[PDB]
């Protein structure tokens, strides 16, 4: 129940990776589609391409997958100055040894130490029983390959029955005592406008 005016949302982005599918990036204001979902995280610089609809990848099959017939797209940019520290900030971390290919758009939160099966390691963290994640470093200076990039994934539904966001915009001026077409609130016609 609001309008998402992306004319300012794409903003003065230094580089907005608006690689979008299913719709032209400019023709969304006139669309009146259903509800939208918001979620975001941060990924190391090189594999920003590695996340995409339905291709292989360690980050893709273990932490976040994207459906093939996906409506929507993502935005990514650089936040090296705000995130990285001189000593290196160690707060960001991703799963390492998931024994499955997680389906797109499902919740998966867990902290138990991974076991390679076979023998019951039983929470000892010995052989074949490894603690996953292996958090990043985010060194104060490095190339674009392992540079912190802030990315947001955007997904909106369809079927148009629960009209949720939409947007009217495009408000023009007014004239009087002249023949002119009027579209005040959806109704259309031709005539002259005066007082009453």
């Amino acid at each position, epitope marked *: 129940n609001c309008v998402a005016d992306y004319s300012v949302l794409y903003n003065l982005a230094p580089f907005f990776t608006f690689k979008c599918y299913g719709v032209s990036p400019t023709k969304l204001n006139d669309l009146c589609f259903t509800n939208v979902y918001a979620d975001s995280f941060v990924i190391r610089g090189d594999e920003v391409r590695q996340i995409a609809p339905g291709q292989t990848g360690n980050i893709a099959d273990y932490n976040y997958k994207l459906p093939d017939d996906f409506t929507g797209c993502v935005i990514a940019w650089n936040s090296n100055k705000l995130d990285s*520290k001189v*000593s*290196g*900030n160690y707060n960001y*971390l991703y799963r390492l040894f998931r024994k499955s290919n997680l389906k797109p758009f499902e919740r998966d939160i867990s*902290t138990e130490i991974y076991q390679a099966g076979n023998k019951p390691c039983n929470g*000892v963290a*010995g052989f074949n029983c490894y*603690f996953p994640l292996r*958090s990043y470093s985010f060194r104060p200076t490095y190339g674009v390959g392992h540079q912190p990039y802030r990315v947001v994934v955007l997904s909106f539904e369809l079927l148009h029955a629960p009209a949720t966001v939409c947007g009217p915009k495009k408000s023009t001026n007014l004239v009087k005592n002249k023949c002119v077409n009027f579209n005040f609130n959806g109704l259309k016609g031709t005539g002259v406008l005066t007082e009453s």
Partner: antibody
Amino acid sequence: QVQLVESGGGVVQPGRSLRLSCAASGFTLSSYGMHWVRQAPGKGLEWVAVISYDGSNKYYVDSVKGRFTISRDNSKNTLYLQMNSLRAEDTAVYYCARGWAYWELLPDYYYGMDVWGQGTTVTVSS
Amino acid sequence: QTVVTQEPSFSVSPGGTVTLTCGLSSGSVSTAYFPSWYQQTPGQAPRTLIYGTNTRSSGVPDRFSGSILGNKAALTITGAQADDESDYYCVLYMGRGIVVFGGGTKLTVLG
């Protein structure tokens, strides 16, 4: 100012029950995680029990399973710990600790405890 | 069960450089386990010194610095003064509620 008041400590016969009381001033306990850590003379600190900011999950150490219960009161900004089946090894000084918050989104296995009150000592004697 | 190994006590002259070590005997220590360094003065409550493996608490002097050394958590202590001698603790985090502290180390100003 942020301060934690620990009351209810004392010396209790083994096998009885007591409710440790903790009052928070300056903030609301509903916004932060809370920790209970005990320390005995001649020993190091020993983790006992914690409560999350939301209270959806509760965790205890193996030595205290099935005997103690932790409860929180958001209305009066007061914290309670239930002690049952006390034994002589429980003679220690407990510190009520305040952890990080949902106000700063952190990953799972939440990082705990930065500031806490003076605490209160408890002894189990016959 | 996991046990954190710590050295009992050090003795270092004032103004010198010393480091404290905290590791795991059951495996390696990663930054995911979130090393933290806390100091306890007997008869009082501890103070928060080092968290985030590289960050100091509010009001903690920059003279204290910590990091990771191989599989052992390391804290760098340079320029010893009289008040730094006290008990010190290292904090490691396991999955979902298991946190294990070390054996405690009593730092001294040597003589």
